[PDB]
Subunit: 386 residues, 4 copies
């Protein structure tokens, strides 16, 4: 069909997928938000579908899907369970994506098959206690030893950090030429869950996405073989930025899914709830919110589809991925907040899903580049183009 | 001192009060947000101070404070514990306020002393499952019987609903002349916790203000004596509106307190957290948020002080109370959301208080008149004045 | 290349078109904004580009272009002269579009060739002094007489009202079945500039779009032949609604053009203007404004391209055209206001074009359905879909 | 009565003042916006009200009014004529205020009587073509010569620049110790309109405030006596900062006046204009805009009254004046834009005053410190307080 809508082939995949989500994922979303229990059962079931190898080429045991279709799949998952959407998006975009992007043929044959089947979930460790937005300020170090490297440092807020079977960690291998250029000298390392040298820190409770595994990683004299070095030594940061460009498309889709769920719930609610003798949807104070949210969410969807298209075409998309994530996350969180408002007192109670949608969506304005950082990324590119 | 700042007499009360809050209330705020355990210990300690009889005249065993001072006290409590602030604000403004406003000398001597000492917490039941914003659409009925009345109906989201010793419930005693004028025929009833006829429904879990008691009340053939009728029969709605005007000043103050706590935390954090070689407070993306929030919160404070002043002067303040609550709640929630953003990933974790500040403040845009309802109230008054 | 980009065919047309605009239209834009002198000379030259018969089939002497290409052409014109863009958009979308939509073969052969060549500009009269948003409340009457009709009424703010050679006027021919169905009974009439019966009222000075011809039309027992009736008698308002859907796509494009011009100017200015030792573009207070505007403008463009595509595909597009116009107009006006701010004092002086961009763009949130009306159109469609 | 209301004394002054404004100023406001003709006649009459020497002590021939009363007077003027309000505010706050602040007894006796009577209007020249927000980067030089100084430089956008009888110009007299301390070495010079050495450049057309005199000043080896030095040599910028604090209070009041005029007009219009069978004020899309604007404008007024009070009390008010100006200007411009929207097409025509209100108010977010600069001033004060 038309570029902006789901084509026949996309519907053939997404239609059945959405029914699976409604039947198997939706029922326990509220409970998972309360308990935080990692959904191993659903991971297993999704993995059997190839969801955890979505972007991985079929040659490596993956589904070989396009960025566009995978993004739509993430939106679909997020509509029913934000935590699961983050689990799926991060696994595919970050750890797996980085190995697919910079891995040698040997590394891709060793890691990709296990990641694509779900046998091994992937964790991507960039952020640290002292550095997030300024990611190049990381302090984890990698020193050269006989047979490989010795890693020492701490990673903060790592998704799948405690359940991962494969880890990709960024560490400094060489001194930076200057503080302005501290990105130089950083390398990436890919390795299977260590027998020793890696421990999970005190788990933090989160505002939302309860069931998503987020943990602190403490690396103490962790040994990794020579084959662990991912990409060229000291040039890992450029690769990190390319990985985040792709990851941002997934987060944009995640945001749209959560915002759409909130809008859909508010629309249905406003049509059935009456006040002053008529459905509240008849008051502009409610209908205008619905119209604005619907419009912004459609705009956000078009933006992430555009970014995905550029990536699928092998063209630069840094600016476009940033714009998509920025707009989708900001619009989605606003839509969720308006949905809470439309339900009134009921929007403040956990028996209804809207308060969870907001709590889950709220992280999309922070993860993989805060909205502030993205505005810098966007402005810089705009100014360069004069 | 100058009208807009705390005078010497106000500081004499608030200064020591704030230290008490820092030492006895602040320490357990996070735990109460997780467990929802009603703070009986703190209620007892505050009650000994007269906090639960703040507006009640000294003749009835109250503290006889001004609306202005009580509002500042609510802001102070909210700064450290939103749930406790709501408990204090609702008890004083609604149940107690309604009895003080419309009670006969006999009723005030019977109820006020117990409410002012905290021996009896007050619950005010207006809202029902089918009516909130359109409060005059309530369905609870009061039928005249020998010796008094028989009440039947359900109240929704009632603060102190399960722990109250005194209840004030609104019910229809006479048929409305028309749907446009359904407010006519509604009466208010004040009574001590019933030996029978009243039961607490399934408790709902909330987005925030966890430790604040919120319950559904089910009235089944509840008998109340003739002396229970509060105000004139069928004219209780006008009184309800006057009670809400006063209550809105307290909620405005509550919002300001929560927003100020968020701003203060973000300011301190931004000064100590460094990125790209400098405190993040040095980046306009952060400092502009701080400046805007500080400015809006000060404006909100001036607005609630103005409303309080008018009430203390015995002058109309419906428009002013609505403006104060509308602006304070909207500004406070925005400030809290910006504080989450400034802390970044840390703003999304429960080890820090900012995510709780937002969750607690979020109800202020809904309770005692949603922002939408308040805009209607304000616009109507503006248009009447031409 | 990709759907959202200009295709090979589009570039071959838009490339030289833009060159013409920069050389012949841009130079006098500022002067026209000051004098309001209608650009008859530019109209003649533009007519050569197919621009005054863009959507009219080649059979009737038009250019036979797609809605998508025409929309891009309107954005291009708007980038350099907002008044000219409105002249082109209205002529094509309203008067011409209505005749193309409901005209009989005889009417199309008689009117379209003259409109499509620019020899006769078209004016569309719907709005009246007492009705705009509530367009079906028009009072202009059309009484049936021997061999035709006699029209009496006043039309307000009609584009091309004083310079038009062809007029399309909506007038009531039959009584409305009920006040709720007042849209029934309205007919459309197409006719050439009469010798009498039509006079132009006191010209009003406008905030922007100075050179765009806007006038009040006073119909005084204006006679029109039987052949003047456009569409089915009493079904004129239905055609009007269809005409507005198409028109809104053009206004959305117009808005994007003006907003893009403001953004581009602000970007160039911020890169060259220094303060405190560096380009002001290096301060986030400035760069964040630029990033947000750019993000919203690109979403707005995607929205109008989507609406144009649906129209070209013969599919429903009422909802989509409303979303495009609403989003684009609101985003463009904000971007223009931000540009004024970025230029500081220079943004307040007419020597620079940004203040004009805002004044011109400001009408896009009002014309062809105010933003408020569009939110209603949007909400209704969303709710009807359940 | 209450602090925030007009006191007995204020009403006795403002009552007749407002009557004068409505009778003598309001009638020609629209015409002056079209012609830009400086209102010399109104200046003479206003001078009678003490308005051109409002803050000047009676000893020096002034009115000896409080900052609070003067601020209310500026709001009153702005309500009817924005250009006149700027003329009064700038004359009083800048040129006159600077001489009153740093002038010696001899300078005050020589300048103030003439400025305070309106016989000599005052121009304050700080801004230059290359420096505005970064005011300390001024390039105008003051070389020491026999019996005085010789000034060379260009001043940009100077209010009263071409009609002033007294000029206060900032020029560098000594080299800056370092680029970071460039504010040191700047001096102020007060002098009467010279016979040569000062010429007015090409007048620029403005977006609004048409009748306000604004001009570029070219100083060409302009000689001024030793007595021209205002304040301590090289310490002129410190006085400049103090002058701006006071000026910002006046601009805040100006903004409130314009915003209030727009709000009042929109309220009256919405009550009388009907659509779809009822006053448009009955649609929340319109009434919510009115309620928000009214709420923000009253907060803005409270903020400027607070700042004025602190100044009158001899207490610090830098932070407060910045907050007042920032809030008032932003709120007023938004209210004016909403008024344009509420009038629909009529809001876009000059026959109605709302488009002028917006154009006039728009400068308040730029003059005497852009909103961006004010947020910096605010943030710095907040952070210094820890
Ligand atoms: C639930 C969750 C899951 C996550 N999963 C992963 C993961 O799987 N892998 C991984 O590596 N990381 C992960 N993260 C970390 C996340 O990427 C970082 O939190 C984020 O990139 C930076 O946030 P921060 O906490 O470092 O805040 P900071 O970087 O300290 O920033 C704090 C505030 O300062 C602002 N700021 C900083 N610099 C500037 C500037 N120059 N201009 C303007 N504003 C600025 C920021 O926008 C923010 O508002 C996760 C975080 C969370 C909460
Ligand atoms: C934690 C909590 C504590 C509370 N405590 C008390 C208490 O102590 N005592 C008590 O009596 N009640 C209490 N309430 C109830 C509260 O007052 C009501 O929820 C509120 O007044 C109305 O909300 P609602 O749930 O009825 O939503 P509704 O009234 O159904 O409204 C839903 C949405 O429609 C909007 N809307 C409705 N009408 C219009 C209109 N005409 N125009 C535009 N928009 C409209 C509302 O603004 C809202 O966005 C409490 C609620 C909560 C959540
Ligand atoms: C420069 C210019 C060119 C124009 N050219 C043409 C033309 O070529 N042909 C033509 O026929 N007309 C033309 N118009 C008129 C334009 O179409 C109308 O102005 C518009 O459709 C309705 O605006 P109005 O002035 O009637 O405002 P109103 O309809 O009176 O509305 C006033 C305010 O009330 C709001 N409002 C009204 N109803 C509701 C509601 N139900 N809910 C919420 N808000 C509501 C509106 O949004 C607006 O904010 C032009 C106008 C201008 C200024
Ligand atoms: C009608 C009018 C009357 C005036 N009257 C007077 C007068 O009487 N006397 C006088 O001396 N001047 C006067 N001015 C000038 C006015 O004071 C200056 O324009 C203003 O102080 C600075 O604006 P600028 O044009 O220099 O913009 P710039 O200083 O170049 O700033 C341009 C943009 O960059 C932003 N910016 C700059 N630095 C930063 C930063 N560090 N962080 C974030 N953003 C930044 C600004 O906010 C603005 O958005 C007047 C101007 C006008 C238009």
């Amino acid at each position: 069909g038309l570029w902006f809508e789901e084509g026949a082939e996309e519907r053939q995949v997404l239609g059945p997928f959405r029914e699976f989500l409604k039947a198997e994922v939706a029922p326990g979303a509220a409970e998972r938000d309360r308990t935080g229990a990692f959904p191993w059962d659903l991971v297993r079931k999704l993995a059997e579908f190839g969801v955890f190898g979505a972007l991985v080429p079929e040659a490596y045991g993956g589904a070989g899907l396009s960025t566009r279709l995978f993004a739509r799949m993430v939106e679909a998952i997020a509509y029913y369970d934000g935590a699961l959407a983050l689990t799926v998006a991060s696994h595919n975009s970050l750890a797996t994506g980085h190995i697919l992007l910079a891995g040698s043929e040997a590394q891709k044959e060793a890691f990709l098959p296990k990641l694509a089947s779900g046998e091994a979930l992937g964790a991507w460790g960039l952020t640290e206690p002292g550095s997030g937005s300024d990611a190049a300020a990381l302090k984890t170090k990698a020193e050269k030893v006989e047979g490989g490297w010795r890693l020492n440092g701490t990673k903060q807020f790592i998704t799948q950090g405690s359940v991962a079977g494969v880890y990709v960690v960024m560490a400094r291998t060489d001194p930076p030429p200057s503080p302005e250029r501290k990105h130089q000298g950083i390398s990436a390392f890919a390795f299977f869950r260590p027998e020793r040298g890696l421990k999970v820190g005190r788990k933090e409770e989160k505002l939302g996405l309860t069931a998503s595994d987020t943990a602190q990683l403490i690396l103490e004299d962790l040994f990794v073989p020579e084959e662990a070095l991912l990409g060229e030594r000291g040039k890992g940061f450029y690769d990190v930025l390319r990985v985040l460009d792709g990851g941002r498309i997934g987060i944009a889709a995640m945001a749209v899914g959560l915002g759409q769920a909130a809008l859909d719930y508010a629309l249905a609610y406003a049509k059935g709830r009456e006040a002053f003798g008529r459905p509240i949807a008849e008051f502009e104070g409610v209908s205008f919110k619905l119209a604005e949210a619907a419009t912004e969410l459609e705009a956000a969807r078009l933006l992430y589809l555009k970014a995905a298209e550029l990536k699928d075409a092998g063209r630069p998309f840094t600016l476009e991925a940033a714009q998509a994530k920025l707009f989708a996350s900001e619009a989605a969180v606003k839509a969720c907040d308006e949905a809470i408002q439309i339900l009134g007192g009921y929007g403040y109670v956990k028996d209804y899903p809207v308060e969870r949608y907001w709590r889950d969506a709220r992280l999309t304005r922070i993860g993989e580049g805060t909205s502030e950082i993205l505005k810098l990324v966007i402005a810089r590119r705009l100014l360069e183009a004069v």
